[PDB]
Amino acid sequence: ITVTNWAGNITYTAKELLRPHSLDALRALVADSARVRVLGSGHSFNEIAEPGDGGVLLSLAGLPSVVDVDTAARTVRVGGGVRYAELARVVHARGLALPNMASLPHISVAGSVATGTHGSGVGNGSLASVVREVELVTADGSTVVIARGDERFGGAVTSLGALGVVTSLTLDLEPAYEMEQHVFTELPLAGLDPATFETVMAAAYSVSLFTDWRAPGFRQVWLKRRTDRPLDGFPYAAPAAEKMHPVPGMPAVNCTEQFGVPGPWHERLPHFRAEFTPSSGAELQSEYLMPREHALAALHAMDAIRETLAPVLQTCEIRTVAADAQWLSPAYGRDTVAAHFTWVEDTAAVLPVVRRLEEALVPFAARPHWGKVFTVPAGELRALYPRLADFGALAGALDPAGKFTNAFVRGVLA
Ligand SMILES: *Cc1cc2c(cc1C)nc1c(=O)[nH]c(=O)nc-1n2C[C@H](O)[C@H](O)[C@H](O)COP(=O)(O)OP(=O)(O)OC[C@H]1O[C@@H](n2cnc3c(N)ncnc32)[C@H](O)[C@@H]1O
Ligand SMILES: OC[C@@H](O)[C@@H](O)[C@H](O)[C@H](O)CO
After folding, report:
1. Which positions in this protein are listed as binding xylitol?
2. What are the helix and strand counts (H, E) for the chain?
3. Does 261 appear as a known binding residue?
4. Which of 6, 138, 207, 291 sits CB 3.0–4.6 Å from 42 for a disulfide?
């Protein structure tokens, strides 16, 4: 069989996707394989999941999708291969909630936290940030549990799958909450000064800007507001008259409910409703995560090259992330602005533009999203992460032979 990622721009070398049906099978398979990479739901856009020729590509799809809510402790134990859509549905039905979700819920929890996946909100950490414990099947088949408080915990959650197979994760939860989603159109870049930009991004619990980099300024602003919090007037852009899709010209029916209609957290945090279940997408993605104080300068750098960006762009999404404790989180150690690009699926045309964008963002210490397309050289990458050395030492300790290190990870650490 031919295995690809979700977008289909990456075809893996493996002629079979190993899907052990028991933990006993899994441990034995790992112990007996020379090199392993796990495939989650394939929502990466590069060779991060590629095991190389003769490497084993393994999935947790054949294992039970455990979602075990502890309502007294407000925690949930989840299989690595569980996706957020089922996780959310389950914890919500128990009166509890996550503090954030990605744009689309049909992604593996283990895969998501492995690369620094995040939503938006100035006080909201990455998805990895609620993880209090990870259970790993290590290179020899044995289980290692690492929990918050361990000196190694900082490299254990966002690990690029390079420590071993995450078989379970435990996550902290809060009481279930309701949210409204208010959409606005045409937020000008002109006059968007440091103070106004801060106001706009803090205007609701989670806020995204979208643009096509065509007409100056921003096409859409999405305020995802918690109904248990104040919402002030938003004078900066016009309220949307119709239901919007972040990509101009795409079906708004796919999207979560707008016009300020209250609904549960897990039906408002994603941009796409649970019913929207694409088996592939005709897109590429890149994303660059920078110190939040550089947001306006970075936005102005994009604006000044927007004729270059636009022709290969579906939409650009601007978000915020609170500083991450995970050593390889692109949000590590600093409050962060994120600039994401959903490109047309045309690798040959997009790569030149990616290199050009990267050159423009270089002075802003832009860290690329590990799951997305980037061309930043390995040496520059290492210079961007203060605690990368400590990650490398943790991987060496837990995986001395580099069973879980592929070409992608090797380049990173080199
Ligand atoms: C396709 C897509 C991606 C996406 C998104 C929306 C869509 C439709 N929305 C995002 C968002 O709102 N915010 C954000 O920061 N990122 C967003 N993305 C990207 C996506 O979340 C990430 O690329 C994510 O890492 C993808 O996870 P997935 O599980 O789908 O991808 P994978 O290629 O198969 O795996 C990613 C890495 O994780 C390792 N992995 C997977 N499972 C395990 C286990 N159980 N144990 C150890 N490692 C694991 C893989 O080996 C690979 O390194
Ligand atoms: O990080 C991924 C998100 O930016 C992405 O899924 C967008 O929200 C989407 O492409 C908008 O249509």
Report:
1. 103, 317, 319, 342, 372
2. 10, 19
3. no
4. 6
- Expt. technique: X-ray
Helix (H) or strand (E) holding 224: strand 218-226
Q: How far apart (Å, rounded) are the C-alpha atoms in residues 379 and 13?
A: 27
Q: Quick one: 138 and 277 in the same domain? A: yes
105 lines ligand 1 (CB under 6 A): no
Report the nearest-CA residue for atom 24 of ligand 1.
112
Which residues, including other chains, have CB under 8 Å from residue 363's CB and lie 6 or more apart?
none
Cβ–ligand 2 distance for 403 under 6 Å, the answer: no
Instruction: Kindly state if the Cβ of 182 falls inside 6 Å of ligand 2.
Output: no
Q: Is the CB of 128 under 6 A from ligand 1?
A: no
Phi (first) and psi of residue 323, to 5 degrees: -50, 135
43 annotated to bind ligand: yes
Q: Which residue's CA is minimally distant from atom 8 of ligand 2? A: 103
DSSP state of 293: G
H/E segment holding residue 36: strand 36-39
In whole angstroms, how far apart are CA 230 and each of 186, 203, 205, 226? Answer: 23, 9, 10, 8
Expressed in angstroms and rounded, the spacing between residue 217 Cα and the centre of ligand 1 is 30
- Residues with Cβ within 8 Å of 169's Cβ and at least 6 positions away in sequence, in order, are 77, 78, 80, 109, 110, 113, 131, 133, 134, 135, 157
8 Å CB contact between 219 and 184: no
Alpha helices in 248-322 (DSSP H): 295-304, 306-309
- Which domain-ending residue is among 211, 230, 264? 264
Same domain, 141 and 276: yes
Give how many domains the chain has, as a whole number.
Answer: 5
Rounded distance between C-alpha atoms, residue 104 and residue 273, angstroms: 8
Please state, in angstroms and rounded to a whole number, the distance separating the CA atoms of residues 367 and 318: 15
CA of 247 to the centre of ligand 2 (A): 9
